[PDB]
Amino acid sequence: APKAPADGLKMDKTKQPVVFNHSVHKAVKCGDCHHPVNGKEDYQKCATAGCHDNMDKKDKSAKGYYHAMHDKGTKFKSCVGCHLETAGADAAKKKELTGCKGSKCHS
């Protein structure tokens, strides 16, 4: 099977890069993130050409990179969407896990 990479990976397609740590996410199935495409979990980088390669942050299509990391109501939970559910009503966790600045994603 594909193996989880080391912690400390940088997502740096944008001027607001974010560090992603697989170990913290080990209770999430791999294929919730590396989701099926044409019936097979796809482990390519998310912004591979033909994937989430649209770097317009207002785009809401299946190519919109920002959309795939931030929005609710998506077919697979996004970073922010899952974090909102995790934080629940806890305001401190909302800031830490979902804040647009001063959060664990963005300084």
* Residues lying near ligand HEM in the complex (CB under 6 A): 2-5, 9, 11-18, 20-22, 24-25, 28, 30, 32-35, 37, 42-48, 50-52, 55, 57, 62, 66, 68-70, 74-80, 82-83, 86, 93, 97-100, 103-106
105 is in an annotated binding site: yes
Give min distance, CB of 64 to ligand HEM, in A.
8
Q: Tell me the closest approach of the beta carbon of residue 53 to ligand HEM, in angstroms.
A: 9
Reduce the DSSP state of residue 105 to 3 states and report it. Answer: coil
* Max intra-chain CA distance, the chain: 39
Distances (CA, A) of 56 to 4, 53, 66: 29, 9, 8
